């Protein structure tokens, strides 16, 4: 087996998951069954613990793992499907070690870091990266691991003491060390500032890893005599210092790779006998001419990351129908009355921009701060007949509110926000939280929705939801509009709801979005970016 | 005595010395006698070993010290001049602490580090501090030490140490330390990242030094709950955090500190009983109106620092008269007909600057290299009556330029560029070095510079020369318009020459540049931007 | 070339010179040309700065270096001569480095630790390893570089740095680190201690070096349990892992190395197709039935390691006669009669010893401290007619008492110890200090030495000195029992004095010490050693 650790420096940010994204995609394009494995250095066992304002977009896998966004752009980048131990974490790591001394199975010896938990974490790797992620029923051949954090971060040291041992083992043929670090310039009259990549490189050495790879990010284009400095005083030769620079696409930056030689280095050293469809994509983009302009009603706006997955499921759909994005970002409290007296000015720019919007898109999301905003949207879009997605809560808000404006139960809400709703509309319905993979079937052959998933009579769809519409309460809407066309395998948990008097408004109980793939928009996006453009009936009868 | 100790994190280039000197701006204000020290931990004895793209411009005291730009900033914003000691370098301290050993004043023990570097450091410290520097014979309040480099610099490390012994010497009521960082945000859409300011506070105080202030450089305004997680992460208070955002000039900077209530923590911790200098300056500043275009015909031009304290003895010039400072920066090299071969569009870009110029600037530099294009600059400046000002090499060109184009002596050179030159007119004329502080006698009472030095027998300026003129080939200028009216008290040396036909071309054999002050400009840069914008003649009458 | 490293853990007084002398000598046996260099970290130039109470004796080379003496432990344990710069220190490297760049040779970029530093001790280290220290004019093999000081020590940093360079320019066929480590055991029914072994060997790979070897020194062998502890946390293989207890002579410390396989390591690692002469000293050591007492009468003797060379010298010399030496280190100041009143005790103790001295030694040393009580045992050696050997200072002192109590000049006196002495019979005169070789010609033919040095016309010895006899006062001595037979090669010098009534008092003017190796006595020592034994008539008939 292969081993590619992809390890931070000066800050996390800088892109290092879409590196190591990247790094396994020139690795697919070399013919390579590649598998990845995040580890995060926190003591978090997952990340459904997580607001998302504090690392993005909990992303969900089939078999309920909620796990960093990273392991949604190994899904993009690679056509793979991981599993909950593909995310690795200090938590996970140091309670396993702990059940294993409570049994006894370290024998009365005194457990400690090293061995134990660096013992653990080369266990860990080695068994996680035999696992068949890509679909074939075969090992892969190479693990892209990203340790996640900076390696400043005194929970990350660990990892780096269990990857210095793992160099050892798996041999400088099997084991590759790439140094994402940043190359800050704070005025462009001065130096390009090394200083950080040759500190950060010089504490990577000082654990024992030596940069295969250092790659320089950067805003412009690095020097040759920064370059140069780098290589000197980071002890490394000029070929292994790579500049990423900021790039027009996300499409672009495996072609950077592959211009700096990093695919050469990797078909060298592997001894491998490329990228046309990142290529294929990055130059169609850029010539893109039509806008589509989606409004997202969301209350995690305030870091766009937050709607990683939902925006990147978008661009798949818009890139796919040869339109530009324009996503109107809202911050859903902002068109609630409340933000009409406490800032006017912000109201009428939300409302502006809902006005603007070709389509709406209600993504999902807990509690009801803002959520009365994301009912002003969604009362908009079923009015002024605007296509909309409403995706889980925005399904039940899109429910409740038909209940209330169409069958008169204006006391019709969730045993969320209302514990005690006089009708409980949506009601809490455990398995557990209703989490990962689950199978939806079709249970009205003229839905929107069928057709655009390939007039399949059910699909699997990865969920993340504690509520459901009420079963009863279904009686309501029986003969009217709001049809509830999708329904879970056990028939009592109703799962995709579309208005049948409106050319596009979906509810899906679901998160179509962390299915979404650059060349498979996920349906339900792509249906919006259709109907917002007129396209929809076009591409139905085609 | 008072000990401000400013330490640079993540990097040194955020504008460091602007704070240190800028403290010291603040502590003048609450009518401290302020001195400062600047240690650089290169094993450099001093600048002049270096080329200008190295560090920027080296800065030539009184006394002939070579020393950092930094230095040049405390005499900027400090009515101070210092002296070769206050650099410290880490060659100066070894060699010292050499010299005691082979004298034996160390008494036959170890010499090591800890205890005898360190003791060296505080000694020289201690002792430079009582220096008045503040031209009143009087012992200073405080001192501001700025430590150069950064905290990951394995350099710095004995004076880190040496001051974690000095706060336990001078107490916390006589030492502070500021710590400077930078917070990168590679994305105005991702969080102001504190991780490099938590990384290099954790760095500081495994050192042994608490911050009393962390200043956070960042291009935008720091956000509050980025303020907070710097206050956490680096364990220090909110009030302790402050946040030096980019502003629109230099004279801001000040204000910003005291904004944020570093004028306040002093005022408290020292218990002194505002800068409203600095706010003049940077309130008409931005409503200057006014333009003066001034080409820098710069062979240096590559790197701005290598023309400091040039670029600010023209803007205190433009600032006095009114006009904000249009600085086109020409590398010479552009100007030279190699150019017009190798590179045409970069050729005719300087020419068209050199057009545009209102007046022509030519700063000093050692070499031939981009000789030819001040020449062409200068033949441009003499012939078509553009405002000119040569600085040591300018003027020893300028001399040159007109033997060969007005006296006929086309075999007219240096002894630099060409050592054999048919009529040396341009000698080596050592005293080594003319280096520092020297006595120029006007020699002509009706020159220009005489009345804008304000109409004095001589004046006593900073030179930085090997190569003089040659006293005999003075008879060539004698009865023509080219006229050297300032000669050194020594006579046989020529230190100032004018052109009697000709609005405003000065040459200078001094740098008039390092003695510039904010609400004192050097007069030759202010003849300069008043000879650019006809005020010259206006002034002189008044 | 091949290169030894030879690093110290948590106390450098472990003997690990004496494990880079027994490396170097198991080379040497293997057949290979060594040489040695010593690194000190320390900023003082030479020993020459230090009390023997600092660092142990100052060893003198014959360029005269005053060196370590780790220097004399290779030149005991090989047959090399050393030279100045194969001591190389932090003061050398660090002047040599501010030389440069006072010269400009650094090309105006800013000298730093790295690179500039680090690559001086690149530069020095394969400049002297080249050199011919073994006497053949041939380039040596491999070059043993010990590491002085810990690998804690901050200031051994820089050279650690530049040998984790230097292990990628010389690559690991060539260079080898070996790391010498204590490990502790505070009583012997508690666990051997490896952690301090553990932490040390982390903190060697944490600066980028990886132990080929660790060496465990400690009292008792090393349990098996321990040496697998030490191998698993310290990540090297049981084979590199060696046990170095102590063992009844230093001739053993090779043939240990051996048993543990080191011979076999470097046999195996650099190809080489024992030490029976080390097998023949050890084994013969043990069986010496025989005692010869002598009376060490030092100044130093507080700390042995003051007179090593001496009394390695002596123990040369009693190996040689099969005799083996109590060494009565002697403090001259208890001798003294202001020891009679202060303490009584350590008085009748040191007469005592005195008494039971069947020769004596007055070696060198500098000042009036004890000189008192070295004129009491030389008083005593003179009438009573002991065997007695003065090295400089009793060279010095013999003749000064002599002429006090044999010539009557009671006033006599060096003009070290009272500069204004009425008839100064010892006086400076310098060549500066007379040091290194310098040849001495005898100048008296039925002299002792002259006949146990071979009876040949000159000797060539190690001087350290300042004062001689005053070449007039010689007329005193001229027909007397003091003859001065042996003079320097310019004749004013006299270099050995003998009595002629006496069976055996020496003075010797140089230090014969330096020169003594294990199967070659310094036959001054040897002449001691014979004489206090009676066998210096029987060996001069031999
Ligand atoms: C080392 C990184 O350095 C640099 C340097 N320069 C630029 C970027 C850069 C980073 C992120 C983005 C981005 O997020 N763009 C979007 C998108 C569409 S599809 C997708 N990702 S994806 O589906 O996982 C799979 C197909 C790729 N992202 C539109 C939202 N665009 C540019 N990154
Ligand atoms: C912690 C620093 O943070 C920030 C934040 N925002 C902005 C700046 C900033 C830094 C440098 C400059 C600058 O160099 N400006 C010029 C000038 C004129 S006078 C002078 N300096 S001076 O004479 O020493 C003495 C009077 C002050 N400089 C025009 C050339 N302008 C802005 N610095
Ligand atoms: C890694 C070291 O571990 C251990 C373990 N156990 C024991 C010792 C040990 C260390 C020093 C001594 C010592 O100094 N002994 C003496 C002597 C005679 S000759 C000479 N040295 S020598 O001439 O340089 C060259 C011929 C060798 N020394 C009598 C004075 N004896 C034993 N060292
Ligand atoms: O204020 C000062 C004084 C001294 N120095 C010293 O100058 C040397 C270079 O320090 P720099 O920060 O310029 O580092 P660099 O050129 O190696 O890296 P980047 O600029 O690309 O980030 C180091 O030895 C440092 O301590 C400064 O950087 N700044
Ligand atoms: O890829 C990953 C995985 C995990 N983590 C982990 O998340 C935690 C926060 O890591 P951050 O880099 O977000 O740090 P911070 O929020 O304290 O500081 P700034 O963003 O302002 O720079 C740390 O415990 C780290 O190891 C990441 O940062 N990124
Ligand atoms: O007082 C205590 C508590 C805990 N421990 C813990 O026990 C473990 C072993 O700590 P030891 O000091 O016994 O280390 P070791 O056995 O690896 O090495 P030596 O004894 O040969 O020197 C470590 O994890 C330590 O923190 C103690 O050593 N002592
Ligand atoms: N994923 C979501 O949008 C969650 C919706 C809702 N709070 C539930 O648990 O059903
Ligand atoms: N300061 C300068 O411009 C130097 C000018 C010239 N090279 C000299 O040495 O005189
Ligand atoms: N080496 C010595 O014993 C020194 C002796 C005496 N102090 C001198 O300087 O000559
Ligand atoms: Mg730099
Ligand atoms: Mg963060
Ligand atoms: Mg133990």
């Not at 007296?341 to 709406?360: M, N, R, S, T």
């Not at 059910?458 to 309460?473: C, K, Q, T």
């Not at 279904?474 to 050319?503: A, W, Y």
Request: hydrophobic share 40%; net charge neutral; with cysteine.
């Amino acid at each position: 087996m292969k081993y590619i650790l992809v390890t931070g420096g000066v800050i996390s940010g800088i892109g290092k998951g879409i590196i190591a994204s990247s790094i396994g995609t020139i690795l697919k394009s070399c013919g390579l069954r590649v598998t990845a494995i995040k580890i995060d250095p926190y003591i978090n066992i997952d990340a459904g613990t997580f607001s998302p304002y504090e690392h993005g977009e909990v992303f969900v896998l089939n078999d309920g793992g909620e796990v960093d966004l990273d392991l949604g752009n190994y899904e993009r980048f690679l056509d793979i499907n991981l599993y909950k131990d593909n995310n690795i974490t200090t938590g996970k790591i140091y309670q396993h070690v702990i059940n294993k001394e409570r049994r006894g199975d370290y024998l009365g010896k005194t457990v400690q870091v090293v061995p134990h938990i660096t013992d653990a974490i080369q266990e860990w790797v080695m068994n996680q990266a035999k696992v068949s992620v890509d679909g074939n029923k075969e090992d892969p051949q190479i693990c892209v691991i990203e340790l996640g954090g900076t390696i400043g971060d005194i929970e990350g040291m660990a990892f780096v003491e269990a990857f210095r041992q793992f160099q050892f083992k798996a041999k400088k043929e099997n084991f590759y060390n790439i140094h994402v670090s940043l190359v800050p310039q704070p005025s462009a009259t001065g130096e390009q500032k090394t200083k950080p990549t040759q500190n950060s490189v010089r504490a990577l050495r000082g654990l024992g890893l030596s940069p295969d790879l250092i790659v320089c990010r950067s805003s412009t284009p690095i020097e040759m005599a920064v370059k140069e400095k780098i290589s000197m005083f980071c002890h490394v030769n000029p070929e292994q210092v790579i500049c990423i620079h900021d790039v027009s696409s996300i499409y672009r930056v495996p072609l950077l790779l592959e211009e700096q030689g990093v695919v050469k280095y990797f078909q060298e050293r592997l001894g491998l006998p490329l990228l046309f469809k990142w290529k294929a994509m990055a130059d169609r983009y850029e010539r893109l001419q039509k806008i589509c302009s989606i409004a997202l009603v969301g209350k995690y706006t305030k870091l766009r990351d937050c709607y990683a997955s939902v925006f990147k499921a978008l661009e798949h759909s818009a890139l796919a129908i040869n339109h530009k994005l324009n996503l109107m970002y809202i911050d859903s409290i902002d068109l609630e009355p409340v933000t009409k007296a406490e800032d006017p000015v912000k109201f009428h720019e939300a409302w502006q921009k809902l006005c603007l919007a070709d389509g709406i898109l209600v993504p999902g999301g807990f509690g009801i701060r803002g959520t009365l905003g994301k009912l002003q949207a969604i009362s908009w879009a079923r009015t002024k007949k605007i296509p909309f997605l409403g995706i889980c809560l925005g399904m039940q808000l899109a429910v409740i509110e038909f209940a209330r404006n169409c069958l008169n139960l204006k006391d019709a809400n969730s045993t969320e926000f209302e514990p005690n709703t006089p009708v409980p509309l949506v009601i809490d319905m455990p398995e557990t939280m209703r989490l990962g993979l689950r199978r939806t079937v079709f249970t009205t052959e003229n839905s929107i929705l069928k057709k655009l998933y390939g007039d399949v009579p059910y699909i699997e769809e990865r969920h993340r939801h504690r509520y459901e519409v009420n079963p009863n309460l279904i009686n309501q809407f029986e003969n009217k509009d709001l049809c509830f066309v999708g329904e879970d395998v056990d028939g009592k948990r109703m799962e995709i709801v579309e208005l049948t008097s409106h050319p596009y408004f979906i509810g899906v109980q679901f998160h179509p979005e962390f299915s979404s793939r650059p060349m498979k928009p996920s349906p339900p996006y792509l249906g919006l970016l259709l109907a917002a453009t007129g396209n929809l009936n076009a591409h139905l009868q085609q």
